[PDB]
Amino acid sequence: TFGRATHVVVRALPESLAQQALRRTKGDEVDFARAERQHQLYVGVLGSKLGLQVVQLPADESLPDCVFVEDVAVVCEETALITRPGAPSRRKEADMMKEALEKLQLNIVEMKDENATLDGGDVLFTGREFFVGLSKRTNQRGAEILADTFKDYAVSTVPVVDALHLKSFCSMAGPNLIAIGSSESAQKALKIMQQMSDHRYDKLTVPDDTAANCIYLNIPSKGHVLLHRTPEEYPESAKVYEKLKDHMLIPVSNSELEKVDGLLTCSSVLINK
Numbered sequence: 655t656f657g658r659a660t661h662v663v664v665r666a667l668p669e670s671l672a673q674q675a676l677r678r679t680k681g682d683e684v685d686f687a688r689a690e691r692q693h694q695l696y697v698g699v700l701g702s703k704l705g706l707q708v709v710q711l712p713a714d715e716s717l718p719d720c721v722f723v724e725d726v727a728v729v730c731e732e733t734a735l736i737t738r739p740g741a742p743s744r745r746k747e748a749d750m751m752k753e754a755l756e757k758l759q760l761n762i763v764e765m766k767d768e769n770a771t772l773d774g775g776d777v778l779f780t781g782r783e784f785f786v787g788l789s790k791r792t793n794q795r796g797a798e799i800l801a802d803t804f805k806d807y808a809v810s811t812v813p814v815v816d817a818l819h820l821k822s823f824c825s826m827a828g829p830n831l832i833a834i835g836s837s838e839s840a841q842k843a844l845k846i847m848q849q850m851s852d853h854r855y856d857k858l859t860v861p862d863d864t865a866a867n868c869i870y871l872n873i874p875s876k877g878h879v880l881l882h883r884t885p886e887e888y889p890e891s892a893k894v895y896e897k898l899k900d901h902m903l904i905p906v907s908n909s910e911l912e913k914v915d916g917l918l919t920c921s922s923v924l925i926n927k
Contacts, residue, residue, distance in 0.1 A: 655872050656781035656826075656829050656872065657781070657826070657828070657829070657870050657871050657872035657878075658871075658872045658874075658926045659706060659871055659872075659924040659925060659926050660706065660707060660925065660926055660927045661706060661707040661708070661709060661758060661924075661925040661926075661927055662700050662701070662706045662707070662708055662709070662922050662923065662924050662925065663708075663709045663711065663723055663727075663751070663754050663755070663758075663922065663923040663925070664693075664696075664697050664700070664708060664709070664710055664711070664721075664723060664921060664922050664923075665710070665711040665712075665713065665720050665721050665723050665750075665921075666693070666710065666711070666712055666713035666720075666721065667686075667689060667690055667693055667713060667720075667721045668713040668714060668715045668717060668718055668720055668721070669686070669713075669715060670715045670716070670717075670718040671684075671686070671689070671718045671719070671721065671914075672684060672686045673718065674718040674719070674914075675913065675914050678913070678914045678915070679913055679914070680913075681913075682913065683913075684910050684911075684913050684914065685910055686910075688909075688910050689910035689911055692906075692907045692908055692909070692910055692911070693721065693911075693921065695906065695907065696881075696906055696908070696918075696921060696922075697710070699881060699904055699906060700922065703904070704871065704873050704876070704879065705873065705875065706924075709754050709757075709758070711723070711750050711751075711754060714746070714747075714750070716746070717743070717744065717746055717747050718743070719741070719743070719744050719747070720744075720747050721911070721916070721920075721921055722775075722916055722920045722921060723747075723751060723920075723921060723922060723923050724774040724775055724919055724920045724921065724922065724923055725737065725739050725744065725747075725773040725774045725775050725791075725920065726739060726744070726747045726748050726751045726774060726923075727748075727751050727755060727774060727923050728772075728774050728777050728779075728800065729755070729760065729923060729924065729925050730779060730804045730807065731926075732759075732760055732761055733760060733761040733762075733763060733803065733804065734755040734760040734761070734762055734763070734925075735763050735764075735765065735799075735800055735803045735804070736748050736751060736752045736755070736762060736763070736764045736765065737765050737772045737773065737774060737796070738765040738766070738767070738770055738771055738772060738796070739771065739772075739773055739791070740771040740772075740773050740789075740790065740791030740792060740793075741791070748764075751923070752764070755923075755925075758925055758927065759927070760925065763803045765796065765799050767795055767799060769793075769795050770793065770795035770796045770798075770799050771791060771792060771793050771795075771796050772786070772791075772792045772793070772796030772797065772799070772800060773789075773791040773792050773819060774923070775791070775818070775819035775820070775821050775822070775917075775919070775920060776788075776789055776791060776792040776814065776819045776820045776821070777800065777820070777821075778820055778821060778824060778825065778826070778832075778847075779826070780826060780830075780832070780855065781826070781829065781830075782807075782851075782853055783807055783808040783809070783810065783851060783853070784800065784801075784804065784807055784808070784809040784810070785809075785810055785811075785812055785820065785847045785850075786800060786809060786810070786811050786812070786820070787811070787812055787813070787814035787819055787820025787821075787843075788811050788812070788813050788814060789814035789817075789818065789819060789820070790814075790818075791818065791819065792814075792819075794811070797809060797811050808851075810847065810850040810851065812843050812846045812847055812850075813843070813846070814843070815839040815842070815843070816837075816839050817839060817840075817863070818915045819915075820843065821867055821917065821919055822863065822864070822867065822915070822917065823835035823837065823839065823840035823843070823863040823864075823866050823867070824840065824843070824844065824866050824867070825866060825867045825868050825869070825870070825918075825919055826870045827858045827868055827870050827880060827895075827898070827901075828858075828870050828878055828880070828898070828901065830855055830856050831855070831856045831857065831858055831870075832844070832847075832855050832856070832857050832858070833857075833858045833859075833860060833866045833867075833868055834857050834858070834859055834860070834866050835859075835860060835861075835862065835863030835864075835865075835866040836859060836860065836861050836862075836863070837863050839863075840863050840866065844857065858894065858895075858897075858898075859894070860888075860890075860891040860894045860895075861888075861890045861891055861894075862883075862888040862890065862891045864883070864888070864912060864917060865882065865883045865887075865888040865891030865892070866891075867883075867917035867918050867919055868880055868881055868882040868883070868895075868918055868919075869881040869918055869919055869922070869924075871924070873902075876902050877900070877901075877902060878898070878900055878901040878902065879901065879902045879904065880895065880898065880901045880902070880903055880904065881904045881906045881918060882895045882903060882904070882905060882906065882918075883905070883906065883907075883908060883918070884905040884906065884907050885905065886907075887907065887908070887909055892905065906918060
């Protein structure tokens with residue numbers, strides 16, 4: 655069943671994240687203490703509230719972005735692709751992630767090609783196929799290696815225009831359901847994805863691009879579950895998610911890490927064992 659997961663890998667925030675953030679903040683500074691609380695709440699939802707087995711990796715002060723585990727690995731079925739992140743400063747994050755996934759007994763494939771880069775944030779897995787954003791972080795070679803890794807699934811690329819990652823404005827909200835932003839860029843990207851696929855997807859359109867990034871899970875003890883940004887953060891988008899009457903909706907705060915481009919999907923790697 656699409657969206658089923660039994661384990662989740664997360665990683666603690668390093669204090670060094672605050673320092674590196676000073677050069678990323680477009681405005682308001684990051685409240686580190688609050689970022690930590692929001693992370694604690696996030697992990698609490700995944701583990702305590704939903705019952706997933708949590709693998710908590712320790713922070714590495716030499717890796718300021720280590721909390722964003724999604725970018726270092728893409729998991730499909732029983733295989734994990736350990737990526738080669740676009741940012742060189744994040745390459746070592748693959749070390750502990752590889753160990754974590756090895757211990758979860760997954761088949762491991764490493765992106766070693768020195769001319770290939772790929773951030774997990776640029777990968778949208780619909781359950782039927784993959785869409786990979788060609789951005790400043792992920793290149794063609796990277797998309798090809800992902801395609802060679804998950805041979806039983808089609809992989810199509812889409813240009814990422816005025817955003818960091820493909821998932822900066824989309825994510826899966828349920829079976830055959832793609833949550834998508836309303837910006838010119840988001841809508842164009844969606845049109846391209848729909849044109850390349852031979853399958854018609856349903857869509858959930860939200861006014862705030864960032865709020866289109868959510869986490870969908872299928873929990874046996876709860877059914878359809880969706881972690882989405884709070885009404886306090888994005889009132890108009892939360893109103894749209896409320897339309898999903900068959901989903902267990904869980905509002906999750908992320909105001910701090912969003913300041914450094916970290917959205918909801920960024921802080922976890924889900925595995926179905």
